[PDB]
Enzyme design. Structure first.
Site, short mmCIF file in Angstrom:
data_model
loop_
_atom_site.label_atom_id
_atom_site.label_comp_id
_atom_site.label_asym_id
_atom_site.label_seq_id
_atom_site.Cartn_x
_atom_site.Cartn_y
_atom_site.Cartn_z
CE1 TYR A 7 -5.76 -1.66 13.20
CE2 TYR A 7 -4.14 -2.94 12.00
CZ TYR A 7 -4.82 -1.75 12.19
OH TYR A 7 -4.55 -0.70 11.36
NE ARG A 13 -4.07 4.88 12.94
CZ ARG A 13 -4.80 5.45 11.99
NH1 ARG A 13 -5.80 4.78 11.43
NH2 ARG A 13 -4.53 6.68 11.59
CD1 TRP A 103 -4.61 5.62 6.51
CD2 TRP A 103 -3.48 4.30 5.09
NE1 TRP A 103 -3.27 5.78 6.76
CE2 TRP A 103 -2.55 4.98 5.91
CE3 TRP A 103 -2.99 3.41 4.12
CZ2 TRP A 103 -1.18 4.80 5.79
CZ3 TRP A 103 -1.63 3.23 4.00
CH2 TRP A 103 -0.73 3.92 4.83
N1 LIG Z 1 -5.41 6.87 16.71
C1 LIG Z 1 -6.18 5.59 16.75
C2 LIG Z 1 -6.88 5.34 15.42
C3 LIG Z 1 -7.77 4.11 15.39
C4 LIG Z 1 -8.42 3.87 14.04
O1 LIG Z 1 -8.98 4.76 13.45
N2 LIG Z 1 -8.31 2.63 13.56
C5 LIG Z 1 -8.92 2.24 12.30
C6 LIG Z 1 -8.13 1.12 11.64
S1 LIG Z 1 -6.42 1.55 11.21
C7 LIG Z 1 -10.37 1.84 12.54
O2 LIG Z 1 -10.76 1.55 13.65
N3 LIG Z 1 -11.17 1.82 11.47
C8 LIG Z 1 -12.54 1.36 11.53
C9 LIG Z 1 -13.53 2.48 11.74
O3 LIG Z 1 -13.22 3.66 11.77
O4 LIG Z 1 -14.76 2.07 11.90
C10 LIG Z 1 -5.24 4.45 17.12
O5 LIG Z 1 -4.02 4.61 16.68
O6 LIG Z 1 -5.61 3.47 17.78
N1 LIG Z 2 -4.70 0.86 6.37
C1 LIG Z 2 -3.99 1.41 7.09
C2 LIG Z 2 -3.16 2.14 8.01
C3 LIG Z 2 -3.69 3.22 8.72
N2 LIG Z 2 -2.99 3.95 9.59
C4 LIG Z 2 -1.68 3.62 9.80
C5 LIG Z 2 -0.92 4.39 10.71
C6 LIG Z 2 0.40 4.09 10.95
C7 LIG Z 2 1.01 3.04 10.29
C8 LIG Z 2 0.30 2.27 9.39
C9 LIG Z 2 -1.06 2.55 9.12
C10 LIG Z 2 -1.83 1.79 8.21
#
Ligand SMILES: N[C@@H](CCC(=O)N[C@@H](CS)C(=O)NCC(=O)O)C(=O)O
Ligand SMILES: N#Cc1cnc2ccccc2c1
Ligand SMILES: N[C@@H](CCC(=O)N[C@@H](CS)C(=O)NCC(=O)O)C(=O)O
Ligand SMILES: N#Cc1cnc2ccccc2c1
Lengths: 198, 199
Positions: A7, A13, A103
């Site tokens: 992460y 998350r 975010w």
């Molecule tokens: N519902 C998914 C969401 C995953 C997600 O969107 N993570 C973000 C970071 S909080 C991410 O990968 N961001 C980079 C991108 O979209 O390229 C989970 O909870 O794993």
């Molecule tokens: N940056 C960021 C971010 C995005 N999604 C979240 C979902 C649940 C709790 C904390 C989180 C923090």
């Protein structure tokens, strides 16, 4: 079983997975990447998102799918199917709310109006409902801790960074945070974990 | 006698996964469909003020995917192993994440349109490519048996096709998966009788 969590350097998350690993005393590699590292990595993951958890060469994805997996056949899941349903539903309610925050929004002005709306107008509705559901129970499900309680501590920790006065009138939800944070494994994790804003 | 009452709008929407599972497992339920104008009378009666809910002996269960997963417990639909159940949950969450980006309730019809078009023309191709890569040449998302993730693809893809009828032209294997789900006898009979709605 080799566990590799990947992460960003934040709670975000991945933190629910980190709590469960702490609570169950399961050793794992906590791999954290900088924003500028991410484009090179993103194409190498099956759904181009983090967190992912590598288990014995297999890459699992979706924070809540992974958390649920790690709690299977433990009381943390909920002891019965009905209780599992309530645990899953509280997590999803919380995640739905956290997912409304813009975010990655680049317009700083818009991000601010939306955040302020979420924290001042919408959060009281969610907090009231969580408070009413918890009622006088020790934990969301009743008389034992579940990963929904973990997730409340986690979500509320970020909400409180954003709006420190948010829990003024929800003493029960503050007690629930405190109960989670006094669980010895969780307390040691909280003391130990990198200090990030989010 | 214990019975199940599903409360949702007159839409497929977030209730349709529950309706497919009930149909597939031959579980009897009341499919209660709320007109939009009656919603504000009903909202106060639900512990978290949202739908769908499943009203059951005493309890009101909420969250579409929590309920869906509850209905698949101890069933091959869930995935047969803990690991497979994780993969199933993850595919469902990936689809849900994407359908959740749509500003369904946005008032500014100009903004709503730009965001829908961006989601459908810019973002959807990445998701479709990843789902197609994940499925590969397998019969179903998990391997050799149907799970509720395949159901959820049929459901999400149905609405996505309403919004953009050419979305799946270059993903024959994702069309094939829809077709296989829709050919399951209990699903086919449910699709046949469900109310025709946009969403
Ligand atoms: N519902 C998914 C969401 C995953 C997600 O969107 N993570 C973000 C970071 S909080 C991410 O990968 N961001 C980079 C991108 O979209 O390229 C989970 O909870 O794993
Ligand atoms: N940056 C960021 C971010 C995005 N999604 C979240 C979902 C649940 C709790 C904390 C989180 C923090
Ligand atoms: N993630 C939740 C979302 C529930 C939700 O927000 N449902 C909408 C309809 S699709 C709703 O209740 N809207 C009416 C409202 O918020 O008053 C679920 O899957 O059940
Ligand atoms: N209005 C609306 C609407 C319709 N279909 C949905 C499918 C998945 C998730 C959210 C949805 C919202």
């Amino acid at each position: 079983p080799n566990y590799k969590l990947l992460y960003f350097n934040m709670r975000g998350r991945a933190e629910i997975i980190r709590y469960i690993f702490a609570y169950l005393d399961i050793k794992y590699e906590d791999h954290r990447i900088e924003q500028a590292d991410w484009p090179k990595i993103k194409p190498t993951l099956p759904f181009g998102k983090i967190p992912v958890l590598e288990v014995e060469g297999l890459t699992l994805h979706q924070s809540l799918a992974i958390a649920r997996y790690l709690t299977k056949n433990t009381d943390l899941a909920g002891k019965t199917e009905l209780e599992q349903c309530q645990v899953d539903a509280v997590v999803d309610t919380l995640d739905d709310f956290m997912s409304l925050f813009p975010w990655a929004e680049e317009n700083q002005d818009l991000k601010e109006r939306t955040f302020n709306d979420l924290l001042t107008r919408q959060a009281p509705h969610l907090l009231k409902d969580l408070d009413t559901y918890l009622g006088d129970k020790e934990w969301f499900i009743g008389n034992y801790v579940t990963w929904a309680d973990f997730y409340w501590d986690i979500c509320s920790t970020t909400l409180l960074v954003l709006k420190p006065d948010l829990l003024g009138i929800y003493p029960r939800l503050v007690s629930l945070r405190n109960k989670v944070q006094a669980i010895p494994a969780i307390s040691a994790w909280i003391l130990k974990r990198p200090q990030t804003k989010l």
